[PDB]
């Protein structure tokens, strides 16, 4: 009886997975936005 059947519930794992997926998508879109921004900065420096 001391040994638990499982540590935590499936709701916590689902929340962790959803948070990880959201963070991955946000970081990917932020990386794409920063790449576009650095390209625009290079174009602006060329124009200057």
């Amino acid at each position: 009886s001391r040994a638990c059947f499982q540590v935590g519930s499936e709701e916590e794992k689902r929340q962790l997975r959803t948070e990880s997926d959201g963070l991955h998508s946000f970081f990917l879109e932020i990386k794409e936005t920063t790449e576009s921004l650095r390209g625009e900065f290079s174009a602006m420096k060329i124009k200057n």
């Binding site: 709701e11 794992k13 959803t18 997926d21």
Partner: protein, 109 residues
């Protein structure tokens, strides 16, 4: 393709559908082998449901739960389950690999 984290689930569903036997396993082969393959597919589905990968996605979770034998979703959405004739044929397709006449009448009533 529409989602961004369902490719593994779709591949698992395709593998389960491939493991699901068809007509080449029974009928003209061996009824015992067909029943064994059906039981193996059912226990594999139960194991895949109890492993924990079906926690997310309430749609696929309900689909897998209906594929096992639980008809809670059917009892909740009986307005879309047509009639009791289709309910009975769905029960037969689910948890009835071999049907007996007396057992058929019992399940019908």
């Amino acid at each position: 393709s529409t989602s961004a984290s369902a490719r593994s689930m779709c591949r698992v569903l395709d593998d389960l559908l491939k493991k699901m036997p068809m007509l080449h396993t029974g009928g003209t082969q061996t009824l015992t082998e067909f029943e064994l393959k059906w039981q193996h597919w059912r226990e594999e589905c139960e194991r895949h449901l109890q492993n924990g990968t079906f926690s997310s996605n309430v749609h696929m979770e309900a689909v897998c739960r209906v594929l096992l034998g639980d008809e809670e979703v059917l009892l909740e959405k009986r307005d879309l389950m047509t009639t009791w004739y289709h309910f009975l044929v769905s029960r037969l397709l689910f948890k009835h690999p071999t049907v007996k006449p007396t057992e058929l009448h019992f399940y019908a009533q």
